[PDB]
Write a protein that binds this ligand. Sequence first.
Ligand SMILES: *[C@@H]1O[C@H](CO)[C@@H](O[C@@H]2O[C@H](CO)[C@@H](O[C@@H]3O[C@H](CO)[C@@H](O)[C@H](O)[C@@H]3O)[C@H](O)[C@H]2NC(C)=O)[C@H](O)[C@H]1NC(C)=O
Ligand SMILES: *[C@@H]1O[C@H](CO)[C@@H](O[C@@H]2O[C@H](CO)[C@@H](O[C@@H]3O[C@H](CO)[C@@H](O)[C@H](O)[C@@H]3O)[C@H](O)[C@H]2NC(C)=O)[C@H](O)[C@H]1NC(C)=O
Ligand SMILES: CC(=O)N[C@H]1[C@H]([C@H](O)[C@H](O)CO)O[C@@](O[C@@H]2[C@@H](O)[C@H](O)O[C@H](CO)[C@@H]2O)(C(=O)O)C[C@@H]1O
Ligand SMILES: *[C@@H]1O[C@H](CO)[C@@H](O[C@@H]2O[C@H](CO)[C@@H](O)[C@H](O)[C@H]2NC(C)=O)[C@H](O)[C@H]1NC(C)=O
Ligand SMILES: *[C@@H]1O[C@H](CO)[C@@H](O)[C@H](O)[C@H]1NC(C)=O
Lengths: 172, 321
Amino acid sequence: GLFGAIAGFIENGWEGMIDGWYGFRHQNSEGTGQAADLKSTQAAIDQINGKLNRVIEKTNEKFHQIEKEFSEVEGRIQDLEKYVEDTKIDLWSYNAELLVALENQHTIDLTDSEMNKLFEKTGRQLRENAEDMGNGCFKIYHKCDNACIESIRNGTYDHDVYRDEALNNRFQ
Amino acid sequence: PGATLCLGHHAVPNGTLVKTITDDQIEVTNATELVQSSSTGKICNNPHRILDGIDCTLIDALLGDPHCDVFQNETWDLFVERSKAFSNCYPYDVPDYASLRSLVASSGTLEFITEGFTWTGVTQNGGSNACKRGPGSGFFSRLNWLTKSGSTYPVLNVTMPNNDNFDKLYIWGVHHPSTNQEQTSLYVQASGRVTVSTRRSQQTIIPNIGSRPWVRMTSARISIYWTIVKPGDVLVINSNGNLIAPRGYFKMRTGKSSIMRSDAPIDTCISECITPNGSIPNDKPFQNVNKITYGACPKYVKQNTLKLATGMRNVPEKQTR
Ligand SMILES: *[C@@H]1O[C@H](CO)[C@@H](O[C@@H]2O[C@H](CO)[C@@H](O[C@@H]3O[C@H](CO)[C@@H](O)[C@H](O)[C@@H]3O)[C@H](O)[C@H]2NC(C)=O)[C@H](O)[C@H]1NC(C)=O
Ligand SMILES: *[C@@H]1O[C@H](CO)[C@@H](O[C@@H]2O[C@H](CO)[C@@H](O[C@@H]3O[C@H](CO)[C@@H](O)[C@H](O)[C@@H]3O)[C@H](O)[C@H]2NC(C)=O)[C@H](O)[C@H]1NC(C)=O
Ligand SMILES: CC(=O)N[C@H]1[C@H]([C@H](O)[C@H](O)CO)O[C@@](O[C@@H]2[C@@H](O)[C@H](O)O[C@H](CO)[C@@H]2O)(C(=O)O)C[C@@H]1O
Ligand SMILES: *[C@@H]1O[C@H](CO)[C@@H](O[C@@H]2O[C@H](CO)[C@@H](O)[C@H](O)[C@H]2NC(C)=O)[C@H](O)[C@H]1NC(C)=O
Ligand SMILES: *[C@@H]1O[C@H](CO)[C@@H](O)[C@H](O)[C@H]1NC(C)=O
């Protein structure tokens, strides 16, 4: 993808995460754990639902048309009838091929984008109290107990509280 | 003693291959099918009025072949013609058969209104053993075979004005005897003629005497023609022999009616979209079932499958296995 997160700097996805599309894994003093991020997950799902509903939007109702199969050889009129239908079918087949190709490239790029947005959002939250390891993980330079982790995940982490502790641990 | 906070995304054990701008196949977590490729094999009887022709073509129902009498005054959204259909009346051709079939199919009705044509000095209601109705000879119910009375067939010259506010469709014909003896025996004059006209247009047909292939006891033929008469116009029919006269007109309508060739059985269900293979769902935007369709239908395409990605790129953990 265009943002380089999914199948890029994040080595792989997690089969264990069954309750969300994007989320968090942590290691601290109290152990390890996992939680889905609902906001990023919902933004991707909403965009994909949106495009699905636009694509399956019913627009075609036809009644009496031309004949398309013929029991007799007739020449010129029938040549034209068949050519008209064959032309139509090819143009529609092309539109169908192009549509899915564009839609799917975009779906891959927007899902890659949502991963990247979450990562960048988390980086900005942690200010000077963490460093980007380069594989989707931040090294957090302070005592971050379970309540502190949850605070990062629900957007309530005050970086100022831990800054001095973290700044000291980072700069030797 | 710090902490690690890793960002990630899900993956699934069973992904799906999709196509993109850059990849002909690449794996995502899920996808949905956009091409309807199957049918039940049955034509749903709702919401469209389906008329099963059974043993009858629309044209035979129109003309009134006796085994098609059940179709008198019928209406339809979709008339279904079966491959077992057969003709069983006087052998006939229709120059521009396809156009007559089309315009009737599209009108959606066989409503017929009898009119009091006066055919002075001829015998009416001719029939043939080629077209049995009960045990004796008969003919197309909507046509009137005129022949000589005594030893004369005068110049017929009749009129029917359209003083209604709708278009009238008249079906008429011309008889082509197999021999000169038959011609003179039936119509007196050695060469007949039929001229049917409105203010705007006219058609003149000269019969051709000669054998055609023997069909149901006869080497003669009837040719079928049609004339539409608009409000305020008038039909004039002029003939000195060989006229197969109309008994009245069909009412024309405009709307959503059509005709389809199919052997699929009709069943109790609801489907907006009809193909010759049967009804198909219309939840997907495309279909590969049949280019011939009726109703609110996915568009026909050549691909039998097209997958729209409904998830992210599926990246499983590599394994040493
Ligand atoms: C991944 O995408 C597929 C579509 O390719 C999803 O499978 C489809 O899921 C829907 C909704 O659960 C199924 O429709 C339902 O089917 C049941 C029983 O057949 C019916 O009673 C319901 O009224 C409803 O129409 C659909 O059948 C199924 N697709 C197929 C081919 O079977 C799937 O849910 C998606 N996966 C995830 C994790 O979202
Ligand atoms: C064969 O039958 C047709 C149909 O009836 C005959 O046509 C009619 O001919 C008369 C005159 O001979 C036309 O009358 C004229 O009408 C105008 C007003 O429209 C009137 O002001 C004139 O004084 C005149 O009388 C009549 O319109 C016409 N009918 C139609 C429907 O056109 C025809 O004459 C017959 N021919 C033979 C040889 O039998
Ligand atoms: C209205 C009339 O004249 N009806 C006749 C009919 C026609 O004259 C004929 O179809 C014109 O082409 O002919 C019918 O009798 C036929 C015999 O004349 C013919 O030689 O043999 C046929 C049987 O192989 C046939 O039956 C008819 O079609 O039934 C007699 C009818 O009254
Ligand atoms: C629906 O019916 C069509 C038309 O009969 C099927 O395609 C035809 O199948 C015949 C016989 O096997 C082939 O020889 C031709 O290639 C096809 N004919 C035409 C005119 O295209 C089609 O397979 C059916 N599809 C489904 C899903 O039932
Ligand atoms: C067909 O409909 C017309 C007009 O309503 C009527 O005069 C005629 O008798 C009908 N015939 C049959 C067989 O239904």
